[PDB]
Design an enzyme around this catalytic site. Structure first.
Site, PDB file in Angstrom:
ATOM      1  N   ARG A   4      20.790  21.629  59.521  1.00  0.00           N
ATOM      2  CA  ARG A   4      19.670  22.113  59.777  1.00  0.00           C
ATOM      3  C   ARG A   4      19.170  23.546  59.452  1.00  0.00           C
ATOM      4  NH1 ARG A   4      20.080  23.064  65.980  1.00  0.00           N
ATOM      5  NH2 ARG A   4      19.742  20.534  66.289  1.00  0.00           N
ATOM      6  N   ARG A  74      18.466  29.836  68.036  1.00  0.00           N
ATOM      7  CA  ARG A  74      17.651  28.553  67.115  1.00  0.00           C
ATOM      8  C   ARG A  74      16.379  29.018  66.656  1.00  0.00           C
ATOM      9  NH1 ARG A  74      22.264  27.643  67.624  1.00  0.00           N
ATOM     10  NH2 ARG A  74      23.235  26.042  68.374  1.00  0.00           N
ATOM     11  N   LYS A 110      23.088  28.987  73.660  1.00  0.00           N
ATOM     12  CA  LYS A 110      22.072  29.157  72.728  1.00  0.00           C
ATOM     13  C   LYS A 110      20.718  29.790  73.585  1.00  0.00           C
ATOM     14  CE  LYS A 110      21.751  24.439  72.667  1.00  0.00           C
ATOM     15  NZ  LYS A 110      21.871  23.328  72.136  1.00  0.00           N
ATOM     16  N   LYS A 112      16.612  30.442  73.030  1.00  0.00           N
ATOM     17  CA  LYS A 112      15.322  29.605  72.401  1.00  0.00           C
ATOM     18  C   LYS A 112      14.067  30.696  72.546  1.00  0.00           C
ATOM     19  CE  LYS A 112      17.149  24.953  72.110  1.00  0.00           C
ATOM     20  NZ  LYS A 112      17.293  23.769  72.347  1.00  0.00           N
ATOM     21  N   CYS A 329      14.040  11.985  70.981  1.00  0.00           N
ATOM     22  CA  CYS A 329      14.815  12.648  70.181  1.00  0.00           C
ATOM     23  C   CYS A 329      15.696  11.918  69.232  1.00  0.00           C
ATOM     24  CB  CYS A 329      15.821  13.256  71.245  1.00  0.00           C
ATOM     25  SG  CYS A 329      17.043  12.069  71.817  1.00  0.00           S
ATOM     26  N   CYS A 335      23.608  11.015  66.480  1.00  0.00           N
ATOM     27  CA  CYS A 335      23.921  11.825  67.601  1.00  0.00           C
ATOM     28  C   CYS A 335      25.199  11.371  68.479  1.00  0.00           C
ATOM     29  CB  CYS A 335      22.763  11.903  68.644  1.00  0.00           C
ATOM     30  SG  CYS A 335      23.370  13.275  69.766  1.00  0.00           S
ATOM     31  N   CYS A 374      19.883  11.322  76.086  1.00  0.00           N
ATOM     32  CA  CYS A 374      20.840  11.852  77.117  1.00  0.00           C
ATOM     33  C   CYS A 374      20.261  13.096  77.953  1.00  0.00           C
ATOM     34  CB  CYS A 374      22.308  12.134  76.411  1.00  0.00           C
ATOM     35  SG  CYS A 374      22.393  13.658  75.648  1.00  0.00           S
ATOM     36  N   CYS A 378      16.919  17.000  74.556  1.00  0.00           N
ATOM     37  CA  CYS A 378      16.266  17.285  73.228  1.00  0.00           C
ATOM     38  C   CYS A 378      14.841  16.854  73.177  1.00  0.00           C
ATOM     39  CB  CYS A 378      16.981  17.005  72.068  1.00  0.00           C
ATOM     40  SG  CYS A 378      18.838  17.410  72.336  1.00  0.00           S
TER      41      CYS A 378
HETATM   42  C1  SRM Z   1      16.887  17.404  66.329  1.00  0.00           C
HETATM   43  C2  SRM Z   1      16.591  17.615  67.916  1.00  0.00           C
HETATM   44  C3  SRM Z   1      15.820  16.436  68.359  1.00  0.00           C
HETATM   45  C4  SRM Z   1      14.572  15.880  67.835  1.00  0.00           C
HETATM   46  O1  SRM Z   1      14.508  14.745  67.707  1.00  0.00           O
HETATM   47  O2  SRM Z   1      13.781  16.606  67.340  1.00  0.00           O
HETATM   48  C5  SRM Z   1      17.766  17.836  68.444  1.00  0.00           C
HETATM   49  C6  SRM Z   1      19.217  17.237  68.158  1.00  0.00           C
HETATM   50  C7  SRM Z   1      20.436  17.654  68.976  1.00  0.00           C
HETATM   51  N1  SRM Z   1      20.546  18.709  69.676  1.00  0.00           N
HETATM   52 FE1  SRM Z   1      19.117  19.419  70.774  1.00  0.00          FE
HETATM   53  N2  SRM Z   1      17.868  18.860  69.627  1.00  0.00           N
HETATM   54  C8  SRM Z   1      16.678  19.215  69.436  1.00  0.00           C
HETATM   55  C9  SRM Z   1      15.945  20.025  70.374  1.00  0.00           C
HETATM   56  C10 SRM Z   1      16.584  20.452  71.548  1.00  0.00           C
HETATM   57  C11 SRM Z   1      15.780  20.902  72.726  1.00  0.00           C
HETATM   58  C12 SRM Z   1      14.060  20.999  72.887  1.00  0.00           C
HETATM   59  C13 SRM Z   1      13.750  22.303  72.277  1.00  0.00           C
HETATM   60  O3  SRM Z   1      14.503  23.134  71.992  1.00  0.00           O
HETATM   61  O4  SRM Z   1      12.354  22.716  72.298  1.00  0.00           O
HETATM   62  C14 SRM Z   1      16.563  20.906  73.804  1.00  0.00           C
HETATM   63  C15 SRM Z   1      16.030  21.086  75.388  1.00  0.00           C
HETATM   64  C16 SRM Z   1      15.808  22.566  75.640  1.00  0.00           C
HETATM   65  C17 SRM Z   1      16.825  23.200  76.042  1.00  0.00           C
HETATM   66  O5  SRM Z   1      17.695  23.767  75.389  1.00  0.00           O
HETATM   67  O6  SRM Z   1      16.883  23.399  77.366  1.00  0.00           O
HETATM   68  C18 SRM Z   1      17.707  20.673  73.352  1.00  0.00           C
HETATM   69  C19 SRM Z   1      18.900  20.808  73.905  1.00  0.00           C
HETATM   70  C20 SRM Z   1      20.286  20.500  73.382  1.00  0.00           C
HETATM   71  C21 SRM Z   1      21.599  20.614  74.165  1.00  0.00           C
HETATM   72  C22 SRM Z   1      21.715  21.028  75.616  1.00  0.00           C
HETATM   73  C23 SRM Z   1      21.856  22.500  75.837  1.00  0.00           C
HETATM   74  C24 SRM Z   1      22.112  23.071  77.072  1.00  0.00           C
HETATM   75  O7  SRM Z   1      21.683  24.042  77.324  1.00  0.00           O
HETATM   76  O8  SRM Z   1      23.022  22.153  77.725  1.00  0.00           O
HETATM   77  C25 SRM Z   1      22.595  20.072  73.320  1.00  0.00           C
HETATM   78  C26 SRM Z   1      23.914  19.873  73.626  1.00  0.00           C
HETATM   79  C27 SRM Z   1      24.910  21.294  73.432  1.00  0.00           C
HETATM   80  O9  SRM Z   1      24.237  22.293  73.062  1.00  0.00           O
HETATM   81  O10 SRM Z   1      26.017  21.320  73.893  1.00  0.00           O
HETATM   82  C28 SRM Z   1      21.898  19.612  72.083  1.00  0.00           C
HETATM   83  C29 SRM Z   1      22.453  19.364  71.059  1.00  0.00           C
HETATM   84  C30 SRM Z   1      21.791  18.616  69.944  1.00  0.00           C
HETATM   85  C31 SRM Z   1      22.790  17.872  68.876  1.00  0.00           C
HETATM   86  C32 SRM Z   1      23.060  18.743  67.593  1.00  0.00           C
HETATM   87  C33 SRM Z   1      23.884  17.127  69.319  1.00  0.00           C
HETATM   88  C34 SRM Z   1      25.099  17.683  69.086  1.00  0.00           C
HETATM   89  O11 SRM Z   1      25.359  18.854  69.999  1.00  0.00           O
HETATM   90  O12 SRM Z   1      26.139  17.253  68.609  1.00  0.00           O
HETATM   91  C35 SRM Z   1      21.607  17.016  68.344  1.00  0.00           C
HETATM   92  C36 SRM Z   1      21.787  16.296  66.836  1.00  0.00           C
HETATM   93  C37 SRM Z   1      21.095  14.831  66.976  1.00  0.00           C
HETATM   94  C38 SRM Z   1      21.106  14.523  65.472  1.00  0.00           C
HETATM   95  O13 SRM Z   1      21.898  13.396  64.993  1.00  0.00           O
HETATM   96  O14 SRM Z   1      20.451  14.931  64.654  1.00  0.00           O
HETATM   97  N3  SRM Z   1      20.631  20.089  72.202  1.00  0.00           N
HETATM   98  N4  SRM Z   1      17.713  20.373  71.779  1.00  0.00           N
HETATM   99  C39 SRM Z   1      15.881  19.051  68.028  1.00  0.00           C
HETATM  100  C40 SRM Z   1      16.248  19.870  66.930  1.00  0.00           C
HETATM  101  C41 SRM Z   1      15.509  21.388  67.215  1.00  0.00           C
HETATM  102  C42 SRM Z   1      15.934  22.450  66.286  1.00  0.00           C
HETATM  103  O15 SRM Z   1      15.550  22.314  65.133  1.00  0.00           O
HETATM  104  O16 SRM Z   1      16.855  23.346  66.621  1.00  0.00           O
HETATM  105  S1  SF4 Z   2      19.288  14.269  73.908  1.00  0.00           S
HETATM  106 FE1  SF4 Z   2      21.214  13.726  73.726  1.00  0.00          FE
HETATM  107  S2  SF4 Z   2      20.979  12.003  72.566  1.00  0.00           S
HETATM  108 FE2  SF4 Z   2      19.090  12.865  72.260  1.00  0.00          FE
HETATM  109  S3  SF4 Z   2      19.474  14.094  70.359  1.00  0.00           S
HETATM  110 FE3  SF4 Z   2      19.665  15.260  72.178  1.00  0.00          FE
HETATM  111  S4  SF4 Z   2      22.079  15.290  72.566  1.00  0.00           S
HETATM  112 FE4  SF4 Z   2      21.384  13.633  71.193  1.00  0.00          FE
END
Ligand code: SRM
Ligand code: SF4
Ligand SMILES: [K+]
Length: 465
Positions: A4, A74, A110, A112, A329, A335, A374, A378
């Site tokens: 990414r 991020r 992290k 944001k 997502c 994922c 989940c 995301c």
């Molecule tokens: C690609 C994306 C979803 C999408 O369809 O666009 C995404 C995909 C994933 N996110 Fe995210 N997140 C994405 C936006 C978000 C957002 C929304 C936002 O930021 O606008 C959230 C919720 C907002 C927030 O953070 O509260 C988000 C909260 C997470 C979390 C939970 C974080 C937490 O505070 O608990 C994880 C899991 C973790 O960090 O342990 C996570 C983890 C992941 C991972 C890397 C899974 C992992 O830890 O192994 C995902 C990879 C999936 C894959 O196969 O590609 N991602 N993730 C987004 C990429 C954004 C970027 O360029 O950085």
């Molecule tokens: S919401 Fe859960 S399933 Fe969807 S991309 Fe984020 S970590 Fe993966």
């Protein structure tokens, strides 16, 4: 097998596009460019042989991916297509400055950040730790309202976790932006619960110490006093699909890309189409926070040539307003944390929603509807009018009662149900909305007004039933 990019504000040059297009097609299993909802892109399935080649590729065009693991920020978002087009250049410069300022203080979790241009909340500011809401006078930025402490991640069955919207701190003149950004980050660094990782996010810190306490420490560290919030209102979160007029003689073409997944499909060569546009386009591209793409800065004389390629490649295939305002997502197959399908579920799910909207005579309307695989969240379902949160294969928690502008968390309505049950519930509810709504009233606001679901007024205390 997952990379990414750092790309503040989603702005990517056509030279950069050609390089990432070539790498995606030749050096990844899936062959795709996946636009993310934080205005950047991902490759999926990079073999071990191609891990060094991909950082060299990015460096060859001035890009860096340098994550994360020891180094927590991020991508910094910036409103992609403001109605006052002249504001974008300055807001983007500040998103870049903030992004560079926060490059490596190890954080507890992290962090944001966004730069937002009212009346558009496309970047979904309430999902983010730190938000700078632009205030302008005479086409020039004068400062920002600061909102702190948003975050959507939750854990099923764990009432100590919750989604939270962001809290207003006050207004700052532009000159204090970087001092304030650093003060918020260092206060969270020092006060965040490091031991409990599920409690370390700023949203929890703010609830533990109180908003005024956190705000006072930021003021002390930044060496400022916040002014009263300056008025601002949002009117929506969607992209401006199609052509809009920009500054000077320039035009912006926003292309709806389902799930941000850029691949050549049968009769729809989306990826080759965007490559051919990149080769002739005079300006840049902008990746939006709705996983779409803007061909930005097209001179009027070039509109016909760009539109021809976009139409022939499938990039301008008409879809409903509903589909334009839906998001999911990545989830399966890549994922590791996925519980239910999201990206691969969304197209047929919205096919079914499209039929319900037509059945009830509201095919021109939309409901902000999002699916997240989940409860990490995301897909930003916990800011949707209708949100689905994956629980297990084929099963979701159904949340109702957010609003169109994204300032309210939807409460859980039904737990752990399948797609047929979700569609049956939504058929009934969309029917009631169509017949009983007030003029211009959104679906989420209606479910609250009609008593279908109780609103979430104070998520740290009342999100969970
Ligand atoms: C690609 C994306 C979803 C999408 O369809 O666009 C995404 C995909 C994933 N996110 Fe995210 N997140 C994405 C936006 C978000 C957002 C929304 C936002 O930021 O606008 C959230 C919720 C907002 C927030 O953070 O509260 C988000 C909260 C997470 C979390 C939970 C974080 C937490 O505070 O608990 C994880 C899991 C973790 O960090 O342990 C996570 C983890 C992941 C991972 C890397 C899974 C992992 O830890 O192994 C995902 C990879 C999936 C894959 O196969 O590609 N991602 N993730 C987004 C990429 C954004 C970027 O360029 O950085
Ligand atoms: S919401 Fe859960 S399933 Fe969807 S991309 Fe984020 S970590 Fe993966
Ligand atoms: K999209």
């Amino acid at each position: 097998m997952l990379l990414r990019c750092r790309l503040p504000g989603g702005v990517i040059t056509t030279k950069q596009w050609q390089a990432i297009d070539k790498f995606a097609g030749e050096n990844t299993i899936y062959g795709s460019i996946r636009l993310t909802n934080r205005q950047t892109f991902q490759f999926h399935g990079i073999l071990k042989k191609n891990v060094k080649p991909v950082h060299q590729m990015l460096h060859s065009v001035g890009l860096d991916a340098l994550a994360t693991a020891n180094d927590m920020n991020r991508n910094v978002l910036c409103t992609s297509n403001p109605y006052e087009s002249q504001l974008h250049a300055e807001a983007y410069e500040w998103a870049k400055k903030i992004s560079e300022h926060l490059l490596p203080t190890y954080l507890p979790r992290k962090f944001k950040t966004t730069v937002v241009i009212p009346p558009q909340n496309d970047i979904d500011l309430h999902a983010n730790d730190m938000n700078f809401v632009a205030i302008a006078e005479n086409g020039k930025l004068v400062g920002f309202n600061l909102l702190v402490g948003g975050g959507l991640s939750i854990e099923h069955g764990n009432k100590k976790t919750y989604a939270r919207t962001a809290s207003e701190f006050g207004y700052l003149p532009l000159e204090h932006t970087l001092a304030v950004a650093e003060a918020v980050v260092t206060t969270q660094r020092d006060w965040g619960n490091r031991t409990d990782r599920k409690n370390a996010k700023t949203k929890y810190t703010l609830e533990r110490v109180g908003v005024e306490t956190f705000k006072a420490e930021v003021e002390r560290r930044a060496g400022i006093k916040f002014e009263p919030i300056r008025p601002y209102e949002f009117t929506g979160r969607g992209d401006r699909i199609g052509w809009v007029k920009g500054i000077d003689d320039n035009w912006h073409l926003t292309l709806f890309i389902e799930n941000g997944r850029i691949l050549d499909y049968p009769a729809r060569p989306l990826k080759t189409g965007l490559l051919e546009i990149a080769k002739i386009h005079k300006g840049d591209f902008r990746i939006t926070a709705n996983q779409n793409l803007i061909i930005a800065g097209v001179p009027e004389s070039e509109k016909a040539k760009i539109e021809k390629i976009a139409k022939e490649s499938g990039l301008m295939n008409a879809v409903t307003p509903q589909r334009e305002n839906s998001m999911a997502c990545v989830s399966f197959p890549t994922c590791p944390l996925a519980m239910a399908e999201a990206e691969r579920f969304l197209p047929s799910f919205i096919d079914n929603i499209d039929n319900l909207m037509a059945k009830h005579g509201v095919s021109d309307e939309h409901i902000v509807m999002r699916v997240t695989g989940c409860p990490n969240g995301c897909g930003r379902a916990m800011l949707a009018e209708v949100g689905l949160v994956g629980k297990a294969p084929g099963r979701y928690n159904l949340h109702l009662g957010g609003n169109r502008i994204g300032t309210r968390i939807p409460r859980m309505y039904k737990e752990n149900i399948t797609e047929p049950e979700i569609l049956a519930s939504l058929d009934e509810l969309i029917g009631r909305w169509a017949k009983e709504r007030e003029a211009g009233e959104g679906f989420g606001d209606f479910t609250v007004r009609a008593g279908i679901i109780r609103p979430v007024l104070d998520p740290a205390r009342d999100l969970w039933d």
